[PDB]
Symmetry: D2
Subunit: 342 residues, 4 copies
């Protein structure tokens, strides 16, 4: 009798009121009985059609539900096994829900994430880091099996044209987004605005236990992403992106890959197929990204950033390896060592 | 010990070889034992670490698999419950696979559909009509809960700029795509080429038992769709589309809605938000569609088509109602009345 | 006193009524006299200011014009050389004007072209064939001198998705567009609709006096163009296109090049840089174009079309050479031999 | 005998060597004499053909030119009026040429502009401010007379994602672009990078003699433009833009309009039709522009900028009026008062 069962029965009802009259015609009443009764004889069935006929007026869904719930929970469940097979969903869709706890630009501000199970309606808090899938996987993959997958979830921490340095709080339960703290106050970029959507990939971690080719360990954070599309995102907004390449930034002695990606919703996504297409269609974009990350902390007392491969942006095949490997590291962190907070 | 278990263990292994060295270092050997052994003491554990140390040379995944499979299937399963929770997929992705049975443009030609379970690797034949989801539902829905869904699977039967009249064979098991037969020969449009991708929505049916507002029943086929993007699709190709509106075509006395939609991969999808945007950005497109469907059978001995609403293209809210209701009709056809073939 | 002179004086007037009060303030009246009066005697300047101050009410432009036209043709002549240098246009822009003489789809239908000189206001009829520039040349070319030009005027005779075979009438004075006549009636394609904007390049001619490399002479018509953008054009509409390549069609034994081009207003024009990009971004488009032109006359009793280079689409460099050479032929036809009608 | 005459004769030559054999066949030699010779005596035509036939080897253009230049200035004069009418260009296209005088980021750096007359080949230095047309006007306007014009030349001083404050030097002859000087050194924005292409409209001037509606005079500079397309421009690059709206910025007590525009080469230009479409397709763009200009000088010791209309972005109709009026002011500055340098 739970809300999940009610939705199943609601879809069942629609198969007998396809045109949404709002009620069951007499013919439809006999038909839903012939259907529910399929794993019965007439003993429990005779009692069923007689019961529904004795309802007063139009058999609305609401009255049909009432009739259904009035039966004994055991006998219901026998025929319900058929109903459930035909009318339950393949999987329960989870709606990502975002809530703010004010006040923005002060240390108290948080962006919290929840799941709303669309079948049960139950809400639970989740971690944008651990619980948002890194890979966007269709239940039924219709794109041809030849073309390989390139659809990643990107969590936007810092929208295009802004400079409040929001971050997934790796140290707090459920890892809400917060504003980073620098010199005791909420941190704003001093160098200038972030000129692309900036954020991170969920279910990745720049491991402090891994010696990257560059001779350093990781910066202890989710893998960083720069989304170069034309649309400004909201803080905490999550959207599907295509990975194009990656910059081997070494930041304060830690590996700090910067993945270049573009929203699958951008008008030029189709035409950007690897890192080399970015100079062709967005000349100066890669140079500006490399330079911004090279110098941005200098005005803050830091030093110029170093880069592996002499600052070369590696291609997408390489970037997806980097992401895959940080997914493994994240598996080791959360699944194996049970660390949900740093 | 099945292929599904092997993939689970392969992802497990990667969490202890994150950098893909191809083997387990000594430290990693102790760690995978501390992990597998978490629901054990030392009795079954002592036997475990001793067993893995006694492997010769580098513990490759292949040797790790061998060691794992050599244990007694019961004791394995106790710790495996933990492994399965951490490293099994949320759901099994199904790869849509298409096979042709030649020869094209003859009556023998068929396009068959299969599912390849990507975890088990098992293939089964499926119906493009019944088994391809009508609605494209993300497991975790990241688009904000306010913006409503508009992502439908479109099965292309007739590609842009062609005239071989392929159709889902509603009368055959597994409903392969075939070429329609007219006057004893494989059917080609006489009027001209189809100038947009033409096909159908899976899990819909223009019910022969429903009296549509127009005073007729349906044409006994899946709901028809015209995809107006610039890209030509392959025969049988399935892709995600956005519904914009619908034309109330009455064809030979049957309701024969023609849904106007556009590929979510087209460069101008973002800008087309309802049926009214089509004349703005694709002037003449709606007029040509209405006219082509109005007259195309006349040169074949048929009559001009009629249209409800005096030929008005209804908007997307209306088109999605039409699609929703034909989904209900399809539920009644397949689930309730158990008809997989017409 | 021409309307041309009036517009010059209107622009002069605006330079002293910059915010468009609609009239001259006293200080502005003194300033326009000091301007008109260099280099004249103080006698003529003071008398000039006096003539204008003696105007009744507000010195609107319309009254300023009146004063000017009443002024003596002598004093005018000396300063007007200055005025003309400062305020005359570099060249007179001609506005293309299109008029129909009904009735459409009958032999009487004509689309006529005119020029309206925006400075003199005089309208004169012109030939879309002879008088519309083949090359679109900016007065000041701002694109870098490195980038070679690829901006051509395309005259649409047959809009996307239509089949009325309109044509520039090479045989009639001013070469209006008419519907071709086949078998005594206005001609419609029997094969199907034209699925791209179809038309011709002005100031070109497939010479009947030239033996093309293919061993045949030309089809005696302007060079044919297929514009593959997503937007449908109106009959007779002229717009700027980018040339991509050309198909060496031989039609009924005559050279009948089919240039592939795309509108500079199309959303994907920037990404289409040569003929090879068409299969990348519009798969099937080239094949469909070749096939349509190969077979369309067969159903009319004609023969399959032939193609040079085995049906290969030559690239944009080759296509521009063909166009340049047909431009030379047109120069010989019109300028040298004075043939405006065939 | 000018290089201008040589190009005329080159085009004439091509009209008799249409396929570019590179020389004149005998029949073509007779034909060019019959052309040049109307209307002359048979004596002069036969002697002319004889002069050219008496040429050694193949009559290439280069030798044809030689023959022409040696011909007697009398006979030339009579036919050349015909030649000039048939083969001279409507107007001489000027190619914009840009030269740097290093060294960049020092006070010595200059970007100079030239015109190369494509017919005469003569190069002369020009002012990007005065000599580049504000309005982009086609010789033959093919867009329908209904559509009003919205095609302006934009001079980029500060490319997208940069912060070197380059400026048209209003104080120097020919008004080269230089880096602004602030506090004795070449000026860089302290606030951050300019996140859109920034520059100015040629042939405009924010007059110091005009009391703007806001109750202040102008900032004595060309009108400022922010180009919001996705493509980064080079310093000094000139390109055609579509005007969308304008921000009524008051900067240090002076009127300092900020016109919002977008490149006619941008993929989404067609879809942006007025200022209201910018929030539809580039959310946050307007807010970010207003805010950047509001605060950027504060970190330099300056004050927040003021805005007329409470910071509202006025629409494109209003923006074009502002531009038209600043064009009038520029006419008064340059043409009437002869001020090319401030
Ligand atoms: Br050009
Ligand atoms: Br224009
Ligand atoms: Cl998880
Ligand atoms: Cl995918
Ligand atoms: Cl910082
Ligand atoms: Cl199903
Ligand atoms: Cl959705
Ligand atoms: Cl048919
Ligand atoms: Cl025909
Ligand atoms: Cl190009
Ligand atoms: Cl010729
Ligand atoms: Cl500054
Ligand atoms: Cl517009
Ligand atoms: Cl002024
Ligand atoms: Mg940080
Ligand atoms: Mg980070
Ligand atoms: Mg960092
Ligand atoms: Mg980082
Ligand atoms: Mg059919
Ligand atoms: Mg159908
Ligand atoms: Mg039908
Ligand atoms: Mg149908
Ligand atoms: Mg013809
Ligand atoms: Mg033609
Ligand atoms: Mg032909
Ligand atoms: Mg032709
Ligand atoms: Mg300045
Ligand atoms: Mg300025
Ligand atoms: Mg200023
Ligand atoms: Mg300014």
């Amino acid at each position: 009798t739970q809300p999940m069962i009610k939705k199943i029965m609601s879809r069942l009802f629609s198969a007998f009121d396809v045109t949404h009259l709002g009620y069951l015609t007499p013919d439809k009443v006999e038909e839903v009985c012939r259907y529910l009764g399929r794993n019965m004889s007439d003993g429990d069935v005779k009692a069923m059609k007689a019961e529904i006929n004795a309802i007063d007026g139009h058999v609305t869904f609401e009255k049909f539900w009432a009739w259904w719930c009035s039966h004994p929970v055991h006998s219901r469940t026998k025929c319900f096994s058929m109903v459930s097979a035909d009318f339950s969903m393949p999987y329960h869709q989870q709606q990502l829900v975002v809530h703010e706890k004010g006040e923005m630009y002060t240390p108290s501000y948080r962006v919290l994430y929840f799941f709303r199970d669309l079948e049960t309606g139950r809400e639970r808090q989740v971690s944008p880091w651990h619980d948002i899938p890194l890979y966007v996987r269709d239940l039924v993959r219709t794109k041809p099996e030849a073309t390989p997958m390139n659809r990643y979830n990107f969590i936007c921490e810092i929208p295009k044209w802004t400079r409040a340095k929001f971050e997934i709080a790796t140290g707090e339960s459920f890892n809400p987004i917060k504003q980073d703290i620098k010199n005791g106050v909420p941190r704003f970029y001093k160098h200038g605005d972030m000129m692309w959507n900036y954020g991170a990939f969920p279910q990745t971690w720049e491991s402090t236990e891994v010696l990257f080719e560059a001779g350093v360990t990781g910066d202890n954070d989710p893998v960083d992403a720069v989304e170069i599309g034309m649309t400004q995102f909201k803080v905490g907004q999550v959207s599907a992106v295509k990975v194009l390449g990656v910059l081997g930034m070494i930041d304060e002695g830690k590996m700090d890959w910067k993945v270049v990606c573009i929203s699958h919703n951008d008008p030029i996504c189709r035409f950007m197929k690897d890192i080399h297409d970015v100079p062709k269609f967005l000349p100066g974009c890669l140079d500006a990204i490399r330079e911004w990350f090279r110098v941005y902390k200098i005005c803050q007392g830091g030093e110029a950033s170093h880069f592996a491969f002499d600052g070369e942006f590696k291609d997408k095949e390489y970037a997806m390896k980097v992401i895959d490997e940080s997914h493994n590291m994240w598996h080791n962190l959360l699944k194996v060592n049970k660390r949900g907070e740093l």
